[PDB]
Design an enzyme around this catalytic site. Structure first.
Site, mmCIF file in Angstrom:
data_model
loop_
_atom_site.group_PDB
_atom_site.id
_atom_site.type_symbol
_atom_site.label_atom_id
_atom_site.label_comp_id
_atom_site.label_asym_id
_atom_site.label_seq_id
_atom_site.Cartn_x
_atom_site.Cartn_y
_atom_site.Cartn_z
ATOM 1 N N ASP A 25 2.881 -10.508 7.740
ATOM 2 C CA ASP A 25 2.564 -10.068 6.093
ATOM 3 C C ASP A 25 2.705 -10.761 5.126
ATOM 4 O OD1 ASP A 25 1.204 -8.635 4.577
ATOM 5 O OD2 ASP A 25 3.289 -7.208 4.327
ATOM 6 N N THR A 26 1.115 -11.488 5.394
ATOM 7 C CA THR A 26 0.759 -12.857 4.170
ATOM 8 C C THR A 26 0.548 -11.774 3.057
ATOM 9 O OG1 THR A 26 -1.212 -12.375 5.126
ATOM 10 C CG2 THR A 26 -0.589 -14.265 5.981
ATOM 11 N N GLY A 27 0.631 -10.161 2.878
ATOM 12 C CA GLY A 27 0.487 -9.652 1.919
ATOM 13 C C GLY A 27 1.181 -8.910 1.303
#
Lengths: 99, 6, 99
Positions: A25-27
């Protein structure tokens, strides 16, 4: 790999002896794992996102291996509903977002 | 759904 | 383009005459925006994040432009610490995780 986004990006990692399925996850600013008992010294901290804050125990210099690419970094253990791999570690295998 | 870290 | 994770995967989105800054979040199933008004009827919904659940107001088949790539879909607004483009609109522009 080249992973598509039709399904949650679930992958196998290994911590301690544990072989686990984490979400890429890039978030995520940090990596968060669900409760587990790693040996080591820690510091509490609070991490947040939709729905507010949750407390977590913060472990330093923890070797991880994300789909055969090992890494070493910080890891937050807390009552999170999914194992999350944050950019702290994505940056180390050389994950990139491409469209 | 689930929506993810700050 | 290829985006790397040393920094937050933040990009400019046009969501009908407005320019917004949102995060390309593959760890998110849906797209949640900070409270704004978007044309149409909305249904009140419920998503969850690391912190627990929040109530959202659901807007259907809404066109969003993400760094000139076009998408059309569910877009949710509520109390999010940032604007997140979920895997629902990411697949439309065809983003993938490479490493």
């Amino acid at each position: 790999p080249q992973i598509t986004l039709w399904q949650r990006p679930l992958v196998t990692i290994r911590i301690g002896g544990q072989l686990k399925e984490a979400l890429l996850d890039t978030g995520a600013d940090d990596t968060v794992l669900e409760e587990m008992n790693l040996p080591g010294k820690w510091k509490p901290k609070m991490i947040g996102g939709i729905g507010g804050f949750i407390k977590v125990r913060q472990y330093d210099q923890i070797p991880v291996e994300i789909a055969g690419h090992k890494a070493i970094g910080t890891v937050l253990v807390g009552p999170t509903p999914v194992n999350i791999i944050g950019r702290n570690l994505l940056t180390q295998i050389g994950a990139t977002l491409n469209f | 759904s689930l929506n993810x870290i700050x």
